[PDB]
Amino acid sequence: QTFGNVALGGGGFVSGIISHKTSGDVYCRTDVGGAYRWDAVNSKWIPLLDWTSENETTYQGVEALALDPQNANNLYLLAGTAYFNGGKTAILKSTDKGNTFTEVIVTSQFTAHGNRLGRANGERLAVDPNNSSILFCGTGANGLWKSTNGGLTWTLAWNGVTTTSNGNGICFVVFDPSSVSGGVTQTIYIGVSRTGANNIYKSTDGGSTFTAIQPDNSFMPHRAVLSSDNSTLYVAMADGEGPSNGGSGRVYKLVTATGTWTNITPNGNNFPYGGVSVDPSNTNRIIVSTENAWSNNQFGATWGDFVFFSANGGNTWTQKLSSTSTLNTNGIGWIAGRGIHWAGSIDFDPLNTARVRVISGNGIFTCDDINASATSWKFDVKGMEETVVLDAISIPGGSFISAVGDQFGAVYSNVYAYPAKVHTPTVTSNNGIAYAANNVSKVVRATDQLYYSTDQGATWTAAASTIGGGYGKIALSADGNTTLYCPSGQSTTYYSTDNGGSWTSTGVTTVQDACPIADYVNTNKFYIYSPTSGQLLVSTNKGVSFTASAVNPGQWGSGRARAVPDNEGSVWVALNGGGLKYTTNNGTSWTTVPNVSYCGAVGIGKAATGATYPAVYIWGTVSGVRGMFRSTDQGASWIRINDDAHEWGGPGNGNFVMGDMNVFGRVYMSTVGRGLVTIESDLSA
Ligand SMILES: OC[C@H]1O[C@@H](O[C@H]2[C@@H](OC[C@H]3O[C@@H](O[C@H]4[C@H](O)[C@@H](O)[C@@H](O)O[C@@H]4CO)[C@H](O)[C@@H](O)[C@@H]3O[C@@H]3O[C@H](CO[C@H]4OC[C@@H](O)[C@H](O)[C@H]4O)[C@@H](O[C@@H]4O[C@H](CO[C@H]5OC[C@@H](O)[C@H](O)[C@H]5O)[C@@H](O)[C@H](O)[C@H]4O)[C@H](O)[C@H]3O)OC[C@@H](O)[C@@H]2O)[C@H](O)[C@@H](O)[C@H]1O
Ligand SMILES: OC[C@H]1O[C@@H](O)[C@H](O)[C@@H](O)[C@@H]1O[C@@H]1O[C@H](CO[C@H]2OC[C@@H](O)[C@H](O)[C@H]2O)[C@@H](O[C@@H]2O[C@H](CO[C@H]3OC[C@@H](O)[C@H](O)[C@H]3O)[C@@H](O[C@@H]3O[C@H](CO[C@H]4OC[C@@H](O)[C@H](O)[C@H]4O)[C@@H](O)[C@H](O)[C@H]3O)[C@H](O)[C@H]2O)[C@H](O)[C@H]1O
Ligand SMILES: [Cl-]
Ligand SMILES: [Cl-]
Ligand SMILES: [Cl-]
Ligand SMILES: [Cl-]
Ligand SMILES: [Cl-]
Ligand SMILES: [Cl-]
Ligand SMILES: [Cl-]
Ligand SMILES: [Cl-]
Ligand SMILES: [Cl-]
Ligand SMILES: [Cl-]
Ligand SMILES: [Cl-]
Ligand SMILES: [Cl-]
Ligand SMILES: [Cl-]
Ligand SMILES: [Cl-]
Ligand SMILES: [Cl-]
Ligand SMILES: [Cl-]
Ligand SMILES: [Cl-]
Ligand SMILES: [Cl-]
Ligand SMILES: [Cl-]
Ligand SMILES: [Cl-]
Ligand SMILES: [Cl-]
Ligand SMILES: [Cl-]
Ligand SMILES: [Cl-]
Ligand SMILES: [Cl-]
Ligand SMILES: [Cl-]
Ligand SMILES: [Cl-]
Ligand SMILES: [Cl-]
């Protein structure tokens, strides 16, 4: 209720599906946005890692997820991202299906990178099916590790493999619990993400020594699974690790009693393969998915990977995703024309193996009846949001409009309703958006080119020219007639009085990735805060020229400063470790907000009833507590409106907080991998 998301649905890469082969619990992991449990009672995904603080953004990268065959309550994640928090890596252990976790930091022993090449391979973390206290973990670069205390500490088990050219190392670990001594499983199979050297190994002494067994080192394994009866190991492989490389591949099966490998590649098509699943009650019933194939014209509407099913252990196969399939959008209209790609994990639902889930670069798709002649695949992403949101606007009396990486963004009359369409044309992303305060039908967005709308985002027309380059931040004057624009990666802000028919430099040439801001009241006034110089630059001639204000707010803040409705000359600046300041006089002087020792982002929203100033929202540290705070009294007092369970890793790539201008208390925040989060902070009930 209080915490949620703008509805979009999936929109990023789910890198693995893991189900409990006895209880039927289903989970997934993602590369940039944590992990989820499928709540089959309520039919929605439940995020499990929204508690990660900004000191734990790293854990949004989930490299492996393991369940305990003997106890469905246990759940383990290997979490870490190379580029956050020093690459800090942990085993995250839960005894309650992910409702709560214990953190076991392992960085100095081994690291993980959820956004690595090879990330859909797995699972490289596994629980001994005979002994809940024993886990093994293959690592990308540090060998094979084990724990004998349920994941609390780890030791090096085997180092015959450590590093590989692709950085992905040991990429699956599978136990055969038919082989046991002293209550410790003795047979372990591992896969290694390399070609031209040994890459599938078997130990029969509990992981102390391994023997190479692969039939063809031209291909590296992605995933493997052992049938419930322990008789047959199925392996998907390709000549690259995926998800976005690999040009050919195979499916193999190993009959363990005789060590017999059979090439069961569907139709000898030799596509790159990643996903494989076996029915827990039928060794011979299997399904596979290609990974990084693109020549399947799914639904007749899109291009992506293939899915093949067999009931005879791979002797013959039937396609289960093709041009005759249909896409059930499940009320999420914008997914039409998109499909299943990077399909490096596929899973029969253990409770009913007529049902199959498959991953994709844009979410997860579910076929509830794999036996149908013309299969129906549902975009099955309720509760899941994985996009990287880059900008947004909230129009008083109008729509909320997002600018999103990969899935472009949408126009919302109800932010909790799934969009029928996303902004088109877009190339890759929209990274900036603006509207005219006194001409609210006029909106502009920045992709490879600028696009203008005269109907509040419903339709778009390209600017005649987009000066400098695309993807920059943008402002529209209050009257809508002037645009200011700084191309991404460039340091000059330009102005146009004709929707980009012509451009002229503002004279501001030294603010890289400038975020120009229009005053809401005075159509001739704009501001640019420069982190490098520490200056607030102000224009009173509609962008023709700027001057620095009398007093600098200070250096090294966020470029995303905010003007204030109904308050000409007011600007709030998030100063990072310099705190939070605001001016009411165009930067002639500044108020230091007491008790704010750090502020990463500031946004404005609808005023409280009976208040005289718009509400202010920050992501920052107030009296020593980092989180989301609201002030309804112009910064004199603050209240925390998030909680320790809802931090999401902080503001992430888009680095913004913004209030809704129509719904008091509602605030939006960007994230590294959880879409656009919302807090409905008006707790009046
Ligand atoms: O090229 C395609 C290829 O990419 C591989 O992945 C690697 C690649 O990732 C790019 C971005 O991935 C994107 O996620 C995708 C995801 O992969 C998809 O599967 C799917 O789910 O969609 C998402 C979204 O599209 C991430 O969103 C994106 O963040 C990744 O880009 C990296 O971002 C890091 C974090 O920073 C950004 O977010 C926090 C903000 O505060 C930052 O402003 C913003 O940059 C970047 O790291 C940051 O880098 C700066 C500067 O670093 C530089 O200067 C100092 C030197 O010491 C550094 O070495 C030097 O790089 C740091 O100051 C900062 O501390 C750090 O956090 C990062 O540079 C940027 O690339 O690229 C990074 C690899 O790690 C990924 O493996 C895929 O594997 C592959 O399949 C294919 O897609
Ligand atoms: O014509 C049909 C088909 O015929 C085959 O025979 C041919 O080989 C195919 O190329 C062709 O299909 C088209 O394939 C490309 C990929 O092509 C590359 O790989 C195969 C090579 O043969 C070829 O030479 C290569 O050029 C597909 O492109 C991929 O599309 C997906 C999905 O894109 C959709 O969703 C995002 C939206 O922005 C797009 O408009 C929409 O189409 C992309 O996946 C998303 O990627 C981003 C991360 O981006 C980055 O990593 C990969 C890199 O290529 C890209 O440039 C980077 O930006 C993630 O955040 C998303 O989560 C993920 O879903 C791929 O990035 C992209 O390569 C064509 O769609 C397909 O029609
Ligand atoms: Cl269900
Ligand atoms: Cl299991
Ligand atoms: Cl159980
Ligand atoms: Cl046990
Ligand atoms: Cl103990
Ligand atoms: Cl070593
Ligand atoms: Cl190698
Ligand atoms: Cl050995
Ligand atoms: Cl079986
Ligand atoms: Cl064997
Ligand atoms: Cl065949
Ligand atoms: Cl085929
Ligand atoms: Cl292909
Ligand atoms: Cl077929
Ligand atoms: Cl697609
Ligand atoms: Cl709304
Ligand atoms: Cl659309
Ligand atoms: Cl208006
Ligand atoms: Cl126009
Ligand atoms: Cl005006
Ligand atoms: Cl700057
Ligand atoms: Cl300064
Ligand atoms: Cl003024
Ligand atoms: Cl704002
Ligand atoms: Cl709390
Ligand atoms: Cl937390
Ligand atoms: Cl309240």
UniProtKB/TrEMBL annotation:
GO terms for biological process: xyloglucan metabolic process. GO terms for molecular function: hydrolase activity. Keywords: Hydrolase. This is Glycosyl hydrolase BNR repeat-containing protein. The chain holds residues 35 to 719 of 908 of the full protein.
